[PDB]
């Protein structure tokens, strides 16, 4: 029963630590089993109603989808419309809505 | 008395002094930012303006006259409260959305919401001062300071440290420390009151900064523009405040608040612990706390970083030659069971010693004694109360009847006179002193101090005497002699509730006034003025500690204190009694549950045949008849080949028992050693099987504090790794031998003990829910006793027995050992530092152990500061560093026990002990002076709670604010 | 065949109950296998079209992304524009759209 | 979310919010009766 201070760590092997870390996920799976099955049902319904295949087609062929979109939308009209839209936000900042409030009220009568 | 009219409604008063107190009880909405109930009115926010009899005045400070007409809804009163709030928001940026103080309790945030205010007329302005992060525990944001002075009122009148002040003479008045000195360099005691009493984030604990919310993590470099963009866009406070309330509500998901009882001193401070996962954000004291309210010391509010230390033990250890190898729980539980039974059936049950801790709960102590008595079959059960509370218990058992305080801490603050005998109360039971100092400051309470060191309590006192070592009993008897001869003593009490007057009178014969002057060293002039004030006062509270306990005649001096109060009628009176300050968090609680080897739980001796059967009926094992051995005497039993094994839980007795040179040799002399500590301590090095315990926050249970207050714990976090709680370990250890105990949670252990214990007859976990607590003796139905011996004493006749005690000559070393070496506690360091030095901020104010020398002593010995000195004793030798200090006197140095090593005052302490209950005499040690160095790193730096200079004052000096010509009262602004 | 009422529960061990709870998830996996493979294909396409790495970069470096955004957007112009935008909603409440309806019709002619 | 929603609906159930939101819906309906065809040349004359 002498005085000692050295400590010897236990051998938690590569697969041992892995099986503990996996059990961590497996526990939260059980803890949220309720929501897991609920989400799976919802997801099954999304495929059932073509929502999932619709997205799959969208990403699988998105290269075409985007090219189709940008080419049609690069008109002079669209460019001006979108620029003027941005311009509108800026000019609607210079406006003093304080004096527009009573201006509205007189039109009401 | 007093009939009033609240907005036309007729009313009547019960006892309220102020209008605000009435409006609060009557559930009427009224803003009151600077009013804190524990602090009293300050008149710094001006948000409580009401029309009483037509006059616009602050309701927080408004005497409740008869026939007053309170108006809390007039357009003029509301308009005035508004003006006040605009001057509050002038010194508040308000960013609740990204502020850590947005948790549904920010008095500013909740008041803006209450006041229906959406546009402040006075915009915010940055204060020209910097944030002070110097202190490792709390910060000061001047830009968020609203000069409410709640912190100032707390530091001066509540904590009574007097560091916090407000410079009103400045252009922008701000909260200053001393003479506007940075907090680390100032006289800051680090209690944490200022942060508890601040209503907003101006005074905030650094553990919450960027941790409380979800958006709080954002760096200030990006969060500051985020705020500026928000202010520019926002319309009214109503909308953005509602969004902030949603983040505040989402905060409940991640933040947990758990009620706990402090594991530091025996004050019994209850408080909530705001934790997010494993990290602690803040210790949030709640107003309804029984022993402290919103009061804390440094340790209780900030000393919890030890729970998250690397030195923490997670997996049990087993000895394997030159090392400790990590081992599985079941394979370790089998090993201890194998040796225990092997030794039991070879040498006897008496060959197994069982040491409990004064840190462990009531249940833990009860089960440790149940394992030793009802499983092993021996009565060898003891805690650290042999050297700590043995004279504190024995002294009272021999005279009044119960081994505990005569009342609660509240009775100390109400008392007319407070007598303090040998107690560094400021740096041992701090929250207790913030009641004594508070009453001395506000109520003019008579305070008498009696010990060899001039500590904080001594300097803030009305009278201070310095008796010699082991001579307190002499002056105690002399005062009693003077009081009884001059007819000053309460004779009605002596006839009514006292048994044995004339016998005790005859024992005071050699204690003449002149005799005391020769022995103690107290001039008869002051000696007679302290005796005259003891008898002059209506109620006297006698507070003694180690300066009485750790002596050759420790129990004699304790008995002398109690019958001195008995002689002047200071029992069963609200505001008087004997108060032996219990040092440990659960030193009273452990003692109550049969941890004494002389008694079973409920203080019933192991000698009653009837009580031995009462416990046997419910345990099923014949309770041992052979009386056990005390913690102190079982050390000798090892050297004599009588003790084979020992089970010490959570106690460092191989560092705190008299002469550690002998107890170290005694440790390596036994066959089996099972230690149950949370860390690998000095005691744990000599162990064969180590069991990793779970600390205070990682378990639930009960703690009976100094005022015999049984409080309940709530599990803050679940055991770290595989560190089972102490009670669980004891159950598993008993089961591995053959006990079959079944307790689903610690509450089940209590109901088994509560039935058997007569004083704890009616103690239930439901009665201790939340901040509820009971004070034993508590009846079977649930009737507790805050004050002891109100109608009768615990003796057959109902009277108290006086104990004649003669001044036993204190055994002094002498010849070559002239410079006496004292021992005691620090404010921040709870012993060696196996919990406090782990909190790295506590290690900045106090980094190492020191030897306090006086300027008179450092002249005759030719020594300076930061020098190595060698104090040699006939029991050991220390390598301490000399600290020049203005507290000690003559040739009497002070060695505080804050180092578990070579500079420990337990090496020098002698084997000699008290002549009644085996109490090691630590305050009876002398040594010789040697020098090793002339210059080095000073043991105590400038950045300490003692080096700074306080600026005392009462209140916040609100008239200084009112003197400024910029200040205009909201009420007369409308006029 | 006497009268008895005591009941003895069966020993559903820690791992036994776990394996039953896991089988619960494994069943809903089979029940929604169709949608599971569909979602995986779609997700593979999102990585294929840089959608997933684009989001990963966004969160991995979001600290910079946000700081960049707020610093540029904290102009006097932006603050006023956004405030006036909010003001517009409030004032468009005081407006009585009832009388604006016939006002529009006369402009049409 | 139980708190989050309760906080939101209670603050947002003002007379102002109810009118603002109703008038917003009303605006969509009335912007249908508008003939954007004649608003197009009306804009062009203001430009000069
Ligand atoms: N020279 C000298 N020596 C003295 C004294 C003196 O004045 N002078 N005073 C003496 C007295 S009165 C006393 S009682 C002793 C103090 O001695 P102790 O009662 O032993 O107190 P500590 O050393 O503070 O705590 C012991 C250990 O408990 C562990 N611990 C903390 N919380 C828990 C918990 O919940 N469970 C468990 N199982 N362990 C925990 C900590 O890691 C700590 O190291 O000192 C004595 N020593
Ligand atoms: N912060 C903090 N709080 C603690 C502790 C800690 O280490 N830190 N430990 C706890 C424990 S284990 C205990 S038992 C208590 C101990 O605390 P109390 O006993 O107050 O604490 P001490 O520091 O021992 O103070 C005793 C004082 O008695 C005086 N004294 C010494 N010798 C004599 C004498 O001959 N005559 C007289 N009249 N006076 C004398 C000295 O001034 C000495 O400081 O505190 C507990 N609280
Ligand atoms: S301290 Fe309170 S009022 Fe001030 S910004 Fe934080 S949450 Fe808002
Ligand atoms: S520092 Fe003092 S005055 Fe300022 S907010 Fe905090 S408690 Fe109030
Ligand atoms: S001394 Fe420090 S911790 Fe104590 S009240 Fe003053 S500022 Fe707060
Ligand atoms: S050590 Fe004592 S005074 Fe300090 S926080 Fe703990 S219980 Fe309160
Ligand atoms: S509460 Fe009355 S002035 Fe602040
Ligand atoms: Mo103690």
């Amino acid at each position: 029963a002498k005085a000692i201070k050295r400590i010897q760590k236990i051998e938690v092997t590569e697969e041992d630590q892995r099986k503990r870390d996996l059990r961590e996920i497996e526990d939260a799976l059980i803890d949220h089993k309720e929501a897991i099955l609920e989400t799976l049902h919802m997801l099954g319904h999304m495929n059932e109603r073509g929502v999932l295949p619709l997205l799959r087609g969208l990403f699988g062929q998105g290269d075409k989808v985007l090219d189709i979109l940008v080419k049609k939308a690069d008109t002079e009209e669209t460019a001006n419309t979108l620029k003027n839209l941005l311009l509108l936000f800026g000019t609607l900042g210079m406006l003093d809505v304080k004096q527009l409030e009573p201006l509205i009220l007189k039109v009401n009568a | 008395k007093k009939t009033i009219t609240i907005n036309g409604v007729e009313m009547e008063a019960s006892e309220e002094q102020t209008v605000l107190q009435l409006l609060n009880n009557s559930s009427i909405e009224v803003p009151q930012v600077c009013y804190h109930p524990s602090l009293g009115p300050i008149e710094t926010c001006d948000t409580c303006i009401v029309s009483i009899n037509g006059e616009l005045k602050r309701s927080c400070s408004a005497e409740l006259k008869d026939g007053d007409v309170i108006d809390t809804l007039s357009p003029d009163v509301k308009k005035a409260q508004v003006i006040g709030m605009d001057k509050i928001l002038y010194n508040h940026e308000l960013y609740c959305t990204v502020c850590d103080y947005n948790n549904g309790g920010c008095e500013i945030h909740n008041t803006v919401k209450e006041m229906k205010i959406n546009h402040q007329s006075i915009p915010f302005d940055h204060k020209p001062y910097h944030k002070d992060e110097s202190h490792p525990f709390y910060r000061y944001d001047p830009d968020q300071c609203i000069l409410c002075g709640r912190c100032v009122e707390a530091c001066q009148d509540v904590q009574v440290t007097e560091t916090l002040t407000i410079d009103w003479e400045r252009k922008r008045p701000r909260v200053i420390w001393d003479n506007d000195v940075p907090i680390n360099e100032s006289s800051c005691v680090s209690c944490g009151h200022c942060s508890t009493v601040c209503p907003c984030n101006a005074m905030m604990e650094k553990g919450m900064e960027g941790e409380a919310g979800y958006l709080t993590g954002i760096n200030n470099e990006t969060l500051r523009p985020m705020i500026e963009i928000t202010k520019g866009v926002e319309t009214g406070y109503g909308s953005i405040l509602a969004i902030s309330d949603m983040e505040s509500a989402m905060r409940d998901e991640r933040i947990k608040k758990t009620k706990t009882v402090c594991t530091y001193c025996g004050v019994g401070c209850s408080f909530d612990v705001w934790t997010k996962g494993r990290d602690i954000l803040k210790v949030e004291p709640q107003e309804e706390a029984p022993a402290n309210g919103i009061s804390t010391c440094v340790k209780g509010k900030f000393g919890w970083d030890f729970v998250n230390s690397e030195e923490r033990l997670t997996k049990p250890l087993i000895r394997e030659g030159d090392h400790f190898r990590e081992a599985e729980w079941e394979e370790a539980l089998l090993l201890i069971a194998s040796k225990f039974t092997e030794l039991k059936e070879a040498f006897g049950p008496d060959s197994l010693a069982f040491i409990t801790s004064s840190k462990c709960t009531n249940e833990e102590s009860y089960l440790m004694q149940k394992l030793a008595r009802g499983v092993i079959g021996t009565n060898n059960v003891d805690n650290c109360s042999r050297y700590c509370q043995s004279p504190a218990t024995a002294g009272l058992f021999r005279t009044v009847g119960y081994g505990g305080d005569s009342g609660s801490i509240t009775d100390i603050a109400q008392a007319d006179l407070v007598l303090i005998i040998g107690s560094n109360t400021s740096e041992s039971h701090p929250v207790l002193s913030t009641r004594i100092k508070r009453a001395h400051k506000l109520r003019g309470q008579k305070v008498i101090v009696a010990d060899i060191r001039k500590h904080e309590m001594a300097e803030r006192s009305d009278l201070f005497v310095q008796p010699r070592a082991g001579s307190d009993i002499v002056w105690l008897n002399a005062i009693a002699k003077y009081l009884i001869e001059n007819g000053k003593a309460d004779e009605r009490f002596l006839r009514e509730r006292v048994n044995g007057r004339d016998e005790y009178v005859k024992s005071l014969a050699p204690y003449t006034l002149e005799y005391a002057e020769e022995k103690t060293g107290i001039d008869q002039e002051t000696l007679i003025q302290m005796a005259e004030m003891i008898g002059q006062a209506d109620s006297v509270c006698a507070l003694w500690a180690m300066g009485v306990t750790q002596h050759i005649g420790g129990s004699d001096t304790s008995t002398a204190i109690s019958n001195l109060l008995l002689v002047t009628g200071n029992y069963g009176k609200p505001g008087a009694g004997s108060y032996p300050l219990r040092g440990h968090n659960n030193v009273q609680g452990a003692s109550d549950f049969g941890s004494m080897p002389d008694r079973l739980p409920g203080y019933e001796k192991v000698t009653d045949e009837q009580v031995r059967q009462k416990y046997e009926r419910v345990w099923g094992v014949p309770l041992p008849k052979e009386p056990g051995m005390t913690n102190h005497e079982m050390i000798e039993k090892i050297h004599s080949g009588q003790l084979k094994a020992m089970y010490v839980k959570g106690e460092e007795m191989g560092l705190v028992d008299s002469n550690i040179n002998h107890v170290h040799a005694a440790y390596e002399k036994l066959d089996f050693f099972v230690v149950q500590d949370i860390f690998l301590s000095r005691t744990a090095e000599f162990a064969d099987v180590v069991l990793p315990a779970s600390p205070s926050l990682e378990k639930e249970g009960t703690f009976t504090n100094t005022e015999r207050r049984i409080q309940r714990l709530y599990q803050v976090f679940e055991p770290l790794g595989e560190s089972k709680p102490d009670w669980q370990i004891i159950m598993e250890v008993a089961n591995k031998l053959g006990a079959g105990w079944l307790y689903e949670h610690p509450a089940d252990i209590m109901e088994e003990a509560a039935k058997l214990s007569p004083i704890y007859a009616g103690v239930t976990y439901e009665r201790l829910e939340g901040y509820n607590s009971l004070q034993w003796p508590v009846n079977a139905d649930g009737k507790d006793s805050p004050l002891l011996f109100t109608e009768r004493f615990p003796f057959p006749d109902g009277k108290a027995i006086l104990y004649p005690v003669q001044w036993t000559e204190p055994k002094e070393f002498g010849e070559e050992y002239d410079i006496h070496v004292n021992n005691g506690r620090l404010l921040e360091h709870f012993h060696e530092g196996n919990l406090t030095y782990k909190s790295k901020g506590i290690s900045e104010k106090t980094p190492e152990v020191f030897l306090e020398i006086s300027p008179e002593l450092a002249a005759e010995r030719g020594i300076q500061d930061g020098t190595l000195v060698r104090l040699t004793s006939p029991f050991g030798n220390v390598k301490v560093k000399c600290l020049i200090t203005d507290r000690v006197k003559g040739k009497e140095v002070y060695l505080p026990m804050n180092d578990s090593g070579e500079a420990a005052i337990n090496l020098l302490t002698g084997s000699h002990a008290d002549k009644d209950t085996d109490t090691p005499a630590y305050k009876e040690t002398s040594a010789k002076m040697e020098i090793l160095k002339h210059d080095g790193i000073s043991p105590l730096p400038k950045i300490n709670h003692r080096n700074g200079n306080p600026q005392p004052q009462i209140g916040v000096q609100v008239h200084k604010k009112w003197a400024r010509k910029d200040y205009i009262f909201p009420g007369d602004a409308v006029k």
Side-chain angles (χ1 to χ4, degrees), chain A residues 1-2 4 6-9, chain B residues 319 322 324 326 668 685:
Chain A
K2 300 271 192 178
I4 58 165
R6 177 151 125 246
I7 274 296
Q8 294 269 13
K9 189 63 62 182
Chain B
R319 216 167 173 94
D322 47 295
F324 271 120
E326 225 156 334
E668 41 214 341
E685 299 185 26

Side-chain angles (χ1 to χ4, degrees), chain A residues 18-33 36:
Chain A
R18 164 190 294 272
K19 295 298 165 177
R20 295 167 144 188
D21 292 337
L22 260 306
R23 226 174 176 255
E24 263 261 29
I25 329 276
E26 284 168 336
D27 274 274
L29 267 182
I30 294 171
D31 303 335
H32 306 296
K33 155 245 199 289
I36 294 302

Side-chain angles (χ1 to χ4, degrees), chain B residues 33 39 59 97 102 112 117 189 256 259 375 449 475 523 608 653 656 716 814 912 975:
Chain B
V33 179
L39 279 300
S59 38
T97 27
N102 173 33
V112 171
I117 165 146
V189 96
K256 178 210 198 173
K259 182 241 180 158
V375 160
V449 178
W475 66 258
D523 60 320
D608 319 82
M653 53 115 74
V656 305
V716 180
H912 61 324
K975 79 205 95 62

Side-chain angles (χ1 to χ4, degrees), chain A residues 5 8 13 19 27 35 45 50 55 57 64-65 70-71 80-82 95 102 106-107:
Chain A
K5 294 196 299 176
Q8 294 269 13
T13 85
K19 295 298 165 177
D27 274 274
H45 283 334
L55 293 156
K64 315 178 187 59
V65 186
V70 307
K71 284 238 217 62
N80 279 324
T81 286
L82 259 295
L95 163 78
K106 313 306 164 287
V107 170

